[PDB]
Symmetry: C6
Subunit: 71 residues, 6 copies
Amino acid sequence: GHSLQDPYLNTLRKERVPVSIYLVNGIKLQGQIESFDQFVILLKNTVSQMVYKTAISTVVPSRPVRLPSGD
Amino acid sequence: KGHSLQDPYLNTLRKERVPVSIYLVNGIKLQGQIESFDQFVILLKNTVSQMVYKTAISTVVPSRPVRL
Amino acid sequence: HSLQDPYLNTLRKERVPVSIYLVNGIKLQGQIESFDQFVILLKNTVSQMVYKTAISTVVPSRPVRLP
Amino acid sequence: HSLQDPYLNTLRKERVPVSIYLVNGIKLQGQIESFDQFVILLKNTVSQMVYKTAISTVVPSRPVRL
Amino acid sequence: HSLQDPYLNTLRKERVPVSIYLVNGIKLQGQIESFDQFVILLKNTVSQMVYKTAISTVVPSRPVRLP
Amino acid sequence: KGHSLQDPYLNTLRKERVPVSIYLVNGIKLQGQIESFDQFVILLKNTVSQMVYKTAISTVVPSRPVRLP
Ligand SMILES: [Cl-]
Ligand code: NA
């Protein structure tokens, strides 16, 4: 049922857009989205850290990105 | 019943481009307009469009009264 | 939902002033305008949509009918 | 289910005063009037509806056996 | 599930003292009297039912040897 | 996208006994090696042994790069 979530994350991934991921505790993670599934996002820099979507509040691209639908 | 209220409510905000605030469970206030949404996230536009997980949302507050 | 629906419907139909406390301790006040499985529309200055996942307790301002 | 329901039911039937602590740390107190899969109705001056998703612990004021 | 269940059942059967840390940082202590899919019943100085949704970590006072 | 990323990722950390830090939703940082895990919990071990609910985890951060899934 991720008809917007999946293509949006896929676009950020394919375009290698640096993102900020804000967590429910206010912490801010930064990096590039490497992969994701129903439950987690793999966010890359020094290592690739695995972020649980339950703990995410908002994903903020570092620059404007064009949604395609269909990814 | 859901989302018999939530969907038309967000869709109205979307179509009418109503300025809104989205308050998160940590207390953070996001501001902008609803660009689109699905079952689990809302895309909120301002300088970029940020994707907000509904799990993390407490309230959505339109900047003005909206119809149905 | 067995208990929520009648309880919220009584509050709505009777226009009972209510407080809704959120999981982070914030207190909202107003009246129930409508609801569905996942959200409550809380009226005052404007109608704000509250996600039930973010609600801890709903406290009426006066006693409400059984149930 | 197998523990939760009989436990809340016992508290309800025996009218045992309980404290319910929420995930934010706030303490509610009253007697459990009814409950379902999602909420507990907790009675004193008014009956307040508590979402189980927001509960940490239910602490009975006295020893209860199920 | 395949790990949580034998782990909790072992702590129960062997009356292992545990500390249960909640998502708000609060610490509960006691021994596990019983549990089901959604709650843990903790007993001792304080007797109480704990919702797993609110738990961050279960820290046994000594390591558990699993089946 | 991804199929199940979580299992092979946790399995690599488990099998290779890779030191990890697990950050919880309240900001608390746990450290150790992944002893085992299932769909809902992770058993972490070293200075303290403990069972962590995934519902309470924000991010798992390996101490060193982990092989491609
Ligand atoms: Cl009442
Ligand atoms: Na152990």
